[PDB]
Amino acid sequence: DIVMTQSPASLTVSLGQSVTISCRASENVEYYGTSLMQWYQQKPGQPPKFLIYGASNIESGVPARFSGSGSGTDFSLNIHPVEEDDIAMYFCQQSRKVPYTFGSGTKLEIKGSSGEVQLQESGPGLVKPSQSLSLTCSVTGYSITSDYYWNWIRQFPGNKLEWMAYIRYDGTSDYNPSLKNRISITRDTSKNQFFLKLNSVATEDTATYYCARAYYYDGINFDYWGQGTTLTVSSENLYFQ
Amino acid sequence: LRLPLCFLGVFVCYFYYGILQEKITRGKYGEGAKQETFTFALTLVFIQCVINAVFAKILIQFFDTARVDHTRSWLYAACSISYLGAMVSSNSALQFVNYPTQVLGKSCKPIPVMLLGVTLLKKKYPLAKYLCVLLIVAGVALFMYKPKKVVGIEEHTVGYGELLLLLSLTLDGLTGVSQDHMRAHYQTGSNHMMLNINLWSTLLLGMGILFTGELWEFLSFAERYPAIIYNILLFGLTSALGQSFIFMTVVYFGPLTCSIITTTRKFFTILASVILFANPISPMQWVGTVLVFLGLGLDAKFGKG
């Protein structure tokens, strides 16, 4: 699969400087002349926010300052007038092949320091290894039978994202080839939920799990995100800590 | 073998396709007064669409199925309406004009594609277009147009056949635009697109043929000459096979080989239809086909996207 690489680990800037973040892919990510690149922004303790699709089109509602450029296997996100609002971690993602991947991410810091669909996650907090686990995502204000993809993603410590799986309203579902033999995804339109089930968990699954909604246009775009639920797997009952 | 040295598949498939089309459409059915020309065009396109759809379904089933389509149905319907319109109009054009003229007219997609691109896409081709198109224009003026239209077809109001040819060309251009846009924005594989558009066209054609009261009616024609029942079927099958073989050329040795093969096949079909069925081509005319084909090949060679 493609291994996305972000060269600048972290950067320091003042207010009134042009900031450019690079991103590279191991294989060409253009299909019939269209580049399949997405850029997201994530503030601390918050789910990522969808910013750019296609490497050149600014999502509606994003301030005009943000822009993208590049092609082939090199892309760059540029903001000339950085303000106080845009201080977060920026991720670049590719959608050329089924196992969608996210980069290691780059951190930017200032020197000197009913109508909408609501998604809510739930599940156990602490679980010993070698035991099956289940997590639920509930959707309100919308019907999961309409034209939208519903995805499960997880983020490890260190903020290394890894898309887990997704299900389409048609009932078709897709899995990550690495995890295809362990995890299962199911849904229920009567109670408007969808569940992710993991078999024989291990200590390596300690992470934060999100359920998100996405639509396909020049590549999958995760428009809406949930609050995310923590999951810690270890050989003890966490008490007085 | 299996290399471009002898790609017998596409060659024989489309050769039989063309010969069968010329035989069935312009066939001299009946004798003397009791003569009934082939006035049915919707049925043939419907049969061809059904066969293409079933072959595409079998091909996708027997080949990779991991891919998941992302296109929307209404886009498929919008493409299919223009696709079936183009096919039906082009097929009906054969009831008035000669077959070589029909194939020459249907082999002039560059003009409409350039026109639509300039009008809407505003794409600029400083040398690829607007410079090599003069060859196509000169060739088409040589063949379909007389010196000053005063000898031959004459300068009288052209028959409905040429207008139908123009309609087919316009619909083909629109279909190409829609297919290109859909592929660019949704990344749809060839097999899924062909299957979906063929299914939509089949449904629309069935509804139309039933409204027109043809299927319920025209079967008497087949009864009088049962042979047409077999031949037409074969025709349709051939087309499907070609598509399958075309897929190979897409994955093997790129699309330039398929384009040149299509051009040489069209020239060979012109030669066959002028040498077998004896459809005389006036003098100072073959040069027109030469000019058109040379321009098409040059475009496919120089200044090709």
Coordinates of C-alpha atoms in Angstrom, one line a residue:
Chain A
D1 CA 0.0 0.0 0.0
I2 CA 1.0 3.7 -0.3
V3 CA 3.1 5.1 2.6
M4 CA 2.4 8.8 2.9
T5 CA 5.3 10.8 4.3
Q6 CA 5.3 14.3 5.9
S7 CA 8.8 15.8 6.0
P8 CA 8.4 18.8 8.4
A9 CA 7.7 17.3 11.8
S10 CA 7.0 20.6 13.5
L11 CA 7.3 24.3 12.6
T12 CA 7.4 27.7 14.3
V13 CA 5.8 30.8 12.9
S14 CA 4.6 34.3 13.8
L15 CA 1.4 36.1 12.8
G16 CA 1.9 37.3 9.2
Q17 CA 4.1 34.6 7.8
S18 CA 3.4 32.1 4.9
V19 CA 3.2 28.5 6.1
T20 CA 3.6 25.6 3.7
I21 CA 3.3 21.9 4.7
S22 CA 4.6 19.2 2.4
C23 CA 3.3 15.7 1.8
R24 CA 4.6 12.8 -0.4
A25 CA 3.3 9.5 -1.6
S26 CA 5.2 6.4 -2.6
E27 CA 3.0 5.9 -5.7
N28 CA 1.3 8.2 -8.1
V29 CA -2.1 9.2 -6.8
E30 CA -3.7 10.7 -9.9
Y31 CA -6.4 8.9 -11.8
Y32 CA -7.5 10.3 -15.3
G33 CA -5.9 13.6 -14.5
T34 CA -7.5 14.1 -11.0
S35 CA -5.4 14.0 -7.9
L36 CA -6.9 12.1 -4.9
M37 CA -5.6 14.1 -1.9
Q38 CA -7.4 15.2 1.2
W39 CA -6.2 17.6 4.0
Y40 CA -7.7 17.6 7.5
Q41 CA -7.0 19.8 10.5
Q42 CA -7.2 18.6 14.1
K43 CA -7.1 20.8 17.2
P44 CA -5.9 19.2 20.5
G45 CA -8.5 17.0 22.1
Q46 CA -10.9 17.4 19.1
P47 CA -11.8 15.2 16.1
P48 CA -10.1 16.2 12.8
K49 CA -11.9 18.8 10.7
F50 CA -12.2 18.3 6.9
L51 CA -10.4 21.1 5.1
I52 CA -9.5 20.3 1.5
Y53 CA -10.4 17.8 -1.2
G54 CA -8.7 17.3 -4.5
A55 CA -5.5 19.2 -3.4
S56 CA -7.0 22.4 -5.0
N57 CA -10.7 22.7 -4.0
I58 CA -11.5 24.5 -0.7
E59 CA -14.4 22.9 1.2
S60 CA -17.3 25.3 1.6
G61 CA -17.1 27.2 4.9
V62 CA -13.3 27.0 5.1
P63 CA -11.7 30.6 5.1
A64 CA -10.2 31.6 1.8
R65 CA -6.7 31.8 3.2
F66 CA -6.2 28.0 3.0
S67 CA -5.0 26.7 -0.4
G68 CA -3.5 23.6 -1.9
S69 CA -1.1 22.8 -4.7
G70 CA 1.0 20.1 -6.2
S71 CA 0.6 16.9 -8.3
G72 CA 2.1 13.6 -9.0
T73 CA 3.6 12.4 -5.7
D74 CA 4.3 15.8 -4.1
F75 CA 1.6 18.1 -2.6
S76 CA 1.7 21.2 -0.4
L77 CA -0.9 23.0 1.7
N78 CA -0.3 26.8 2.0
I79 CA -1.7 29.4 4.3
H80 CA -0.3 32.9 3.9
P81 CA -2.0 34.9 6.7
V82 CA -1.9 32.5 9.6
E83 CA -4.0 33.8 12.5
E84 CA -4.7 32.6 16.1
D85 CA -7.5 30.3 14.9
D86 CA -5.4 28.0 12.8
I87 CA -3.0 26.4 15.3
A88 CA -3.4 22.6 15.1
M89 CA -2.1 19.4 13.5
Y90 CA -2.6 18.9 9.8
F91 CA -2.9 15.5 8.1
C92 CA -2.7 14.5 4.5
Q93 CA -4.6 11.5 3.2
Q94 CA -4.8 9.6 0.0
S95 CA -7.7 7.6 -1.5
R96 CA -6.1 6.0 -4.5
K97 CA -6.5 2.4 -3.2
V98 CA -8.8 0.7 -0.7
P99 CA -6.5 0.9 2.4
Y100 CA -6.8 4.6 2.9
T101 CA -3.8 5.9 4.9
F102 CA -3.0 9.1 6.9
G103 CA 0.4 10.7 7.3
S104 CA 2.3 11.0 10.6
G105 CA 1.0 14.6 10.8
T106 CA 2.7 18.0 11.3
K107 CA 2.3 20.2 14.3
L108 CA 2.2 24.0 13.9
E109 CA 2.8 26.4 16.9
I110 CA 3.2 30.1 17.4
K111 CA 6.6 31.0 18.8
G112 CA 6.6 32.1 22.4
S113 CA 4.0 29.7 23.7
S114 CA -31.7 18.6 14.7
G115 CA -31.2 19.5 11.0
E116 CA -27.5 18.4 11.4
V117 CA -26.5 14.8 11.8
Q118 CA -25.2 14.0 15.3
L119 CA -23.0 10.9 15.9
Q120 CA -22.3 9.5 19.4
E121 CA -20.0 6.6 20.3
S122 CA -20.3 4.2 23.1
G123 CA -18.6 1.0 24.4
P124 CA -16.5 -0.5 27.2
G125 CA -13.6 1.4 28.7
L126 CA -11.3 -1.2 30.0
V127 CA -10.9 -4.8 28.8
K128 CA -8.3 -7.6 29.2
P129 CA -6.5 -9.0 26.1
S130 CA -7.8 -12.1 24.5
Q131 CA -11.4 -11.1 24.8
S132 CA -13.8 -10.0 22.1
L133 CA -15.0 -6.4 22.2
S134 CA -17.9 -4.4 20.7
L135 CA -18.5 -0.7 20.1
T136 CA -21.6 1.2 19.0
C137 CA -22.2 4.4 17.1
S138 CA -25.6 6.0 17.2
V139 CA -26.8 8.6 14.6
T140 CA -29.6 11.1 15.3
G141 CA -31.1 13.8 13.1
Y142 CA -30.7 11.7 10.0
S143 CA -31.4 8.3 8.5
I144 CA -28.5 5.9 7.8
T145 CA -30.4 4.6 4.8
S146 CA -29.7 7.7 2.7
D147 CA -26.7 8.3 0.4
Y148 CA -23.8 8.4 2.8
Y149 CA -20.9 6.2 3.9
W150 CA -20.4 5.5 7.6
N151 CA -16.8 4.7 8.7
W152 CA -15.0 3.5 11.8
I153 CA -11.5 4.9 12.3
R154 CA -9.0 4.7 15.2
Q155 CA -6.1 6.8 16.4
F156 CA -3.2 5.4 18.4
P157 CA -1.1 7.3 20.9
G158 CA 1.2 9.6 19.0
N159 CA -1.7 10.6 16.7
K160 CA -1.1 8.1 14.0
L161 CA -4.5 7.6 12.3
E162 CA -5.6 4.3 10.7
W163 CA -8.9 3.9 8.9
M164 CA -10.6 0.7 10.2
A165 CA -13.6 0.1 7.9
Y166 CA -16.8 1.5 6.5
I167 CA -20.3 0.5 5.5
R168 CA -22.5 2.1 2.8
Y169 CA -26.3 2.6 3.0
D170 CA -26.7 0.0 0.3
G171 CA -25.4 -2.6 2.7
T172 CA -22.0 -2.9 1.0
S173 CA -19.1 -2.9 3.4
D174 CA -15.3 -2.5 3.1
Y175 CA -12.5 -3.5 5.4
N176 CA -8.8 -2.8 5.8
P177 CA -6.9 -5.8 4.4
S178 CA -4.7 -5.9 7.5
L179 CA -7.7 -6.1 9.8
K180 CA -10.1 -7.9 7.5
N181 CA -9.5 -11.2 9.4
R182 CA -10.2 -9.8 12.9
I183 CA -12.9 -7.0 12.8
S184 CA -16.5 -7.1 11.6
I185 CA -18.9 -4.3 10.9
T186 CA -22.7 -4.5 11.3
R187 CA -25.6 -2.1 11.3
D188 CA -29.2 -1.8 12.4
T189 CA -31.6 0.6 10.8
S190 CA -34.4 -0.1 13.3
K191 CA -32.5 1.5 16.2
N192 CA -30.3 3.6 13.8
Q193 CA -27.0 2.3 15.0
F194 CA -23.9 0.5 13.6
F195 CA -21.5 -1.6 15.5
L196 CA -17.8 -2.7 15.2
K197 CA -16.8 -6.0 16.7
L198 CA -13.1 -7.0 17.4
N199 CA -12.0 -10.5 18.0
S200 CA -9.2 -11.5 20.5
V201 CA -8.0 -8.0 21.2
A202 CA -4.4 -7.5 22.2
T203 CA -2.5 -4.7 24.0
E204 CA -1.8 -3.0 20.7
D205 CA -5.4 -1.8 20.3
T206 CA -5.1 0.9 23.0
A207 CA -6.5 3.9 21.1
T208 CA -9.3 6.4 20.5
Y209 CA -12.1 5.2 18.2
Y210 CA -14.2 7.6 16.0
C211 CA -17.3 6.9 13.9
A212 CA -17.6 9.4 11.0
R213 CA -19.8 10.1 8.0
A214 CA -18.3 10.6 4.5
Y215 CA -19.3 11.2 0.9
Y216 CA -17.4 10.3 -2.3
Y217 CA -16.3 13.0 -4.6
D218 CA -12.8 13.0 -6.0
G219 CA -12.0 10.6 -3.2
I220 CA -13.7 9.8 0.1
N221 CA -14.1 12.8 2.4
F222 CA -14.9 12.4 6.1
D223 CA -17.2 15.5 6.5
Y224 CA -18.6 14.7 9.9
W225 CA -16.9 13.2 13.0
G226 CA -18.0 12.0 16.4
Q227 CA -16.5 12.9 19.7
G228 CA -14.5 9.6 19.9
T229 CA -14.3 7.0 22.7
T230 CA -11.2 5.8 24.5
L231 CA -10.2 2.2 24.7
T232 CA -7.4 0.9 27.0
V233 CA -6.5 -2.8 26.9
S234 CA -4.2 -4.1 29.7
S235 CA -3.8 -6.9 32.2
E236 CA -5.2 -5.1 35.2
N237 CA -8.2 -3.2 36.7
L238 CA -7.3 0.4 36.7
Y239 CA -8.0 1.7 40.2
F240 CA -6.9 4.8 42.1
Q241 CA -5.2 6.2 39.1
Chain B
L1 CA 1.2 -15.3 -29.5
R2 CA -1.4 -13.0 -27.8
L3 CA 0.8 -10.0 -28.6
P4 CA -0.1 -7.1 -31.0
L5 CA 1.6 -9.1 -33.8
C6 CA -1.8 -10.8 -34.6
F7 CA -4.7 -9.5 -32.5
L8 CA -7.2 -11.5 -34.5
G9 CA -9.9 -11.0 -31.9
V10 CA -10.8 -7.4 -32.5
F11 CA -10.0 -7.6 -36.2
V12 CA -12.3 -10.5 -37.0
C13 CA -15.0 -9.4 -34.5
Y14 CA -15.4 -5.9 -36.0
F15 CA -15.0 -7.2 -39.6
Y16 CA -17.9 -9.5 -39.1
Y17 CA -19.8 -6.8 -37.3
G18 CA -19.5 -4.4 -40.2
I19 CA -20.2 -6.9 -42.9
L20 CA -23.3 -8.2 -41.0
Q21 CA -24.5 -4.7 -40.4
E22 CA -24.2 -3.8 -44.1
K23 CA -25.9 -7.1 -45.1
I24 CA -28.8 -6.8 -42.7
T25 CA -29.6 -3.1 -43.0
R26 CA -29.3 -2.8 -46.8
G27 CA -30.4 -6.3 -47.5
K28 CA -32.6 -6.7 -50.6
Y29 CA -35.4 -8.4 -48.8
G30 CA -38.2 -9.6 -51.1
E31 CA -38.4 -9.6 -54.9
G32 CA -39.9 -7.0 -57.2
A33 CA -43.1 -5.5 -55.9
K34 CA -43.1 -7.7 -52.8
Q35 CA -40.1 -5.9 -51.4
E36 CA -39.9 -4.8 -47.7
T37 CA -36.8 -2.8 -46.8
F38 CA -35.4 -3.1 -43.3
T39 CA -37.4 -0.4 -41.6
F40 CA -36.8 -1.7 -38.1
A41 CA -34.0 -0.1 -36.2
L42 CA -35.0 0.0 -32.5
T43 CA -35.2 -3.8 -32.3
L44 CA -31.6 -4.3 -33.5
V45 CA -30.2 -1.8 -31.1
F46 CA -32.2 -3.4 -28.3
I47 CA -30.9 -6.8 -29.0
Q48 CA -27.3 -5.5 -29.3
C49 CA -27.6 -3.7 -25.9
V50 CA -29.0 -6.9 -24.2
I51 CA -26.2 -9.0 -25.5
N52 CA -23.6 -6.5 -24.6
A53 CA -25.0 -6.2 -21.1
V54 CA -25.0 -10.0 -20.5
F55 CA -21.5 -10.4 -21.8
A56 CA -20.3 -7.5 -19.6
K57 CA -21.9 -9.0 -16.6
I58 CA -20.3 -12.4 -17.3
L59 CA -16.9 -10.7 -17.8
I60 CA -17.1 -8.8 -14.5
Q61 CA -18.2 -11.9 -12.7
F62 CA -15.3 -14.0 -14.1
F63 CA -12.7 -11.2 -13.5
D64 CA -11.7 -9.0 -10.5
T65 CA -14.7 -8.0 -8.3
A66 CA -12.9 -6.3 -5.4
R67 CA -13.6 -2.9 -7.0
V68 CA -16.7 -1.1 -5.5
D69 CA -18.5 1.4 -7.8
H70 CA -19.0 4.9 -6.6
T71 CA -21.1 6.5 -9.4
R72 CA -24.7 7.6 -9.1
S73 CA -27.5 5.9 -11.1
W74 CA -28.9 9.1 -12.5
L75 CA -25.6 9.8 -14.2
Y76 CA -25.7 6.3 -15.8
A77 CA -29.2 7.1 -17.1
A78 CA -28.1 10.5 -18.4
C79 CA -25.2 8.8 -20.3
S80 CA -27.4 6.0 -21.6
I81 CA -30.1 8.2 -23.1
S82 CA -27.6 9.9 -25.3
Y83 CA -25.8 6.7 -26.1
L84 CA -29.0 4.9 -27.3
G85 CA -30.1 8.0 -29.2
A86 CA -26.8 8.1 -31.1
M87 CA -26.9 4.4 -31.8
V88 CA -30.5 4.5 -33.0
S89 CA -30.1 7.6 -35.2
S90 CA -26.9 6.3 -36.8
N91 CA -28.6 2.9 -37.5
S92 CA -31.7 4.6 -39.0
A93 CA -29.4 6.8 -41.2
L94 CA -28.7 3.7 -43.3
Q95 CA -32.2 3.6 -44.7
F96 CA -31.5 6.6 -47.0
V97 CA -27.7 7.0 -47.5
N98 CA -25.1 4.5 -48.6
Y99 CA -23.1 2.5 -46.1
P100 CA -19.7 4.1 -46.9
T101 CA -21.1 7.5 -46.3
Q102 CA -22.6 6.3 -43.0
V103 CA -19.3 4.9 -41.8
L104 CA -17.4 8.0 -42.9
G105 CA -19.9 10.2 -41.0
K106 CA -19.7 8.1 -37.9
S107 CA -15.9 8.2 -38.1
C108 CA -15.7 12.0 -37.5
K109 CA -15.8 12.3 -33.7
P110 CA -12.8 14.7 -33.5
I111 CA -14.8 17.6 -34.9
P112 CA -17.7 17.4 -32.3
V113 CA -15.4 16.6 -29.4
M114 CA -13.2 19.7 -30.2
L115 CA -16.3 21.8 -30.7
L116 CA -17.8 20.8 -27.3
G117 CA -14.5 21.2 -25.6
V118 CA -13.9 24.7 -26.9
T119 CA -17.5 25.9 -26.3
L120 CA -17.7 24.7 -22.7
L121 CA -14.4 23.3 -21.4
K122 CA -12.5 26.1 -23.2
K123 CA -9.5 23.8 -23.6
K124 CA -7.0 25.2 -26.0
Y125 CA -5.0 23.1 -28.6
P126 CA -2.7 25.6 -30.4
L127 CA -1.4 22.9 -32.8
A128 CA -3.2 19.6 -32.2
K129 CA -6.6 21.1 -33.1
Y130 CA -7.5 24.0 -35.4
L131 CA -4.5 23.0 -37.5
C132 CA -4.8 19.3 -38.4
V133 CA -8.6 19.5 -38.6
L134 CA -8.3 21.1 -42.0
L135 CA -7.3 17.7 -43.3
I136 CA -10.6 16.1 -42.0
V137 CA -12.6 19.0 -43.4
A138 CA -11.0 18.7 -46.8
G139 CA -11.5 15.0 -46.9
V140 CA -15.1 15.2 -45.9
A141 CA -15.7 18.0 -48.4
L142 CA -14.1 15.8 -51.1
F143 CA -16.2 12.7 -50.4
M144 CA -19.6 14.0 -49.2
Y145 CA -19.5 17.3 -51.1
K146 CA -19.0 17.7 -54.8
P147 CA -16.8 20.4 -56.5
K148 CA -19.6 23.0 -56.0
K149 CA -22.3 20.5 -55.2
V150 CA -23.4 20.8 -58.9
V151 CA -22.6 17.2 -60.0
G152 CA -23.6 14.1 -58.0
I153 CA -25.9 14.4 -55.0
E154 CA -26.7 17.9 -56.3
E155 CA -27.2 21.1 -54.3
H156 CA -30.8 20.3 -53.5
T157 CA -32.0 20.0 -49.9
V158 CA -30.2 16.9 -48.5
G159 CA -32.3 14.0 -47.5
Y160 CA -33.2 13.1 -43.9
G161 CA -30.3 10.7 -43.8
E162 CA -27.6 13.4 -43.5
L163 CA -29.6 15.2 -40.9
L164 CA -29.8 12.0 -38.9
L165 CA -26.1 11.6 -39.3
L166 CA -25.6 15.0 -37.8
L167 CA -27.9 14.2 -34.9
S168 CA -25.9 11.0 -34.3
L169 CA -22.6 12.9 -34.3
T170 CA -23.9 15.5 -31.8
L171 CA -25.3 12.8 -29.5
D172 CA -22.0 10.9 -29.7
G173 CA -20.1 14.1 -28.7
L174 CA -22.5 14.7 -25.7
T175 CA -22.1 11.0 -24.6
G176 CA -18.3 11.3 -24.7
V177 CA -18.5 14.5 -22.7
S178 CA -20.7 12.9 -20.0
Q179 CA -18.5 9.7 -19.9
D180 CA -15.3 11.7 -19.5
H181 CA -16.8 13.9 -16.8
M182 CA -18.2 10.9 -14.8
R183 CA -14.9 9.0 -15.1
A184 CA -12.9 12.1 -14.0
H185 CA -15.0 12.9 -11.0
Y186 CA -16.1 9.4 -9.7
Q187 CA -13.3 7.0 -10.9
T188 CA -15.6 4.4 -12.5
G189 CA -14.2 1.3 -14.2
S190 CA -15.0 0.5 -17.8
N191 CA -16.9 -2.7 -17.0
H192 CA -19.3 -1.2 -14.5
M193 CA -20.0 1.8 -16.8
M194 CA -20.7 -0.4 -19.8
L195 CA -23.0 -2.7 -17.8
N196 CA -25.0 0.2 -16.2
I197 CA -25.4 2.2 -19.4
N198 CA -26.4 -0.9 -21.4
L199 CA -29.0 -1.9 -18.8
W200 CA -30.5 1.6 -18.7
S201 CA -30.6 1.7 -22.5
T202 CA -32.2 -1.7 -22.6
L203 CA -35.0 -0.6 -20.3
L204 CA -35.6 2.6 -22.2
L205 CA -35.6 0.8 -25.5
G206 CA -38.0 -1.8 -24.3
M207 CA -40.5 0.8 -23.1
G208 CA -40.2 2.7 -26.3
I209 CA -40.6 -0.4 -28.6
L210 CA -43.6 -1.5 -26.6
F211 CA -45.2 2.0 -26.9
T212 CA -44.5 2.1 -30.6
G213 CA -46.3 -1.2 -31.1
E214 CA -43.4 -2.8 -33.0
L215 CA -42.5 -6.0 -31.0
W216 CA -46.1 -6.8 -30.8
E217 CA -46.4 -6.2 -34.6
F218 CA -43.2 -6.6 -36.6
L219 CA -42.8 -10.3 -35.9
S220 CA -44.9 -11.0 -39.0
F221 CA -41.9 -9.6 -41.0
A222 CA -39.6 -12.1 -39.4
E223 CA -42.2 -14.9 -40.0
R224 CA -42.2 -14.1 -43.7
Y225 CA -38.4 -14.3 -43.8
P226 CA -37.3 -16.4 -40.8
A227 CA -33.7 -16.1 -41.7
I228 CA -33.4 -12.6 -40.3
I229 CA -34.0 -14.1 -36.8
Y230 CA -30.6 -15.8 -36.9
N231 CA -28.4 -13.3 -38.7
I232 CA -29.3 -10.3 -36.5
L233 CA -28.5 -12.3 -33.4
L234 CA -25.0 -13.1 -34.7
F235 CA -24.5 -9.4 -35.4
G236 CA -25.2 -8.4 -31.8
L237 CA -22.9 -11.1 -30.4
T238 CA -20.0 -9.9 -32.5
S239 CA -20.2 -6.4 -31.0
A240 CA -20.0 -7.8 -27.4
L241 CA -16.9 -9.9 -28.2
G242 CA -15.2 -6.8 -29.5
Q243 CA -15.7 -4.9 -26.3
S244 CA -14.1 -7.8 -24.3
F245 CA -11.1 -7.9 -26.6
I246 CA -10.9 -4.2 -26.5
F247 CA -10.4 -4.5 -22.7
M248 CA -7.2 -6.5 -23.4
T249 CA -5.8 -3.7 -25.6
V250 CA -6.6 -1.3 -22.7
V251 CA -4.5 -3.2 -20.3
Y252 CA -1.9 -4.5 -22.8
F253 CA 0.3 -2.0 -24.9
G254 CA -1.9 1.0 -24.1
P255 CA -4.7 2.6 -26.0
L256 CA -2.7 4.0 -29.0
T257 CA -2.6 0.4 -30.4
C258 CA -6.3 0.1 -30.1
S259 CA -6.9 3.5 -31.7
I260 CA -4.7 2.6 -34.7
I261 CA -6.3 -0.8 -35.0
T262 CA -9.8 0.9 -35.1
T263 CA -8.7 3.3 -37.8
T264 CA -7.2 0.6 -40.0
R265 CA -10.3 -1.6 -39.4
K266 CA -12.5 1.3 -40.5
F267 CA -10.5 1.7 -43.7
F268 CA -10.6 -2.0 -44.3
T269 CA -14.4 -2.0 -43.8
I270 CA -14.7 0.8 -46.4
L271 CA -12.6 -1.2 -48.8
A272 CA -14.7 -4.3 -48.2
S273 CA -18.0 -2.6 -48.6
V274 CA -16.9 -1.0 -51.8
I275 CA -15.3 -4.1 -53.3
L276 CA -17.7 -6.9 -52.1
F277 CA -21.3 -5.5 -52.3
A278 CA -20.5 -3.3 -55.3
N279 CA -21.4 0.2 -54.1
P280 CA -19.6 2.3 -56.7
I281 CA -17.6 5.2 -55.4
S282 CA -17.2 8.0 -57.9
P283 CA -13.8 9.3 -59.0
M284 CA -12.0 12.1 -57.1
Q285 CA -13.7 10.5 -54.0
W286 CA -11.3 7.8 -52.7
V287 CA -8.9 10.6 -52.2
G288 CA -11.4 12.1 -49.7
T289 CA -11.4 8.9 -47.6
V290 CA -7.6 8.9 -47.8
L291 CA -7.5 12.5 -46.5
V292 CA -9.9 11.9 -43.7
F293 CA -8.1 8.7 -42.5
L294 CA -4.7 10.4 -42.8
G295 CA -5.9 13.3 -40.7
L296 CA -7.4 11.0 -38.1
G297 CA -4.1 9.0 -37.9
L298 CA -2.0 12.2 -37.6
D299 CA -4.2 13.4 -34.8
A300 CA -3.9 10.0 -33.1
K301 CA -0.1 10.3 -33.6
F302 CA 0.7 14.0 -33.2
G303 CA -0.9 16.2 -30.6
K304 CA -2.8 13.4 -28.9
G305 CA -3.8 13.9 -25.2

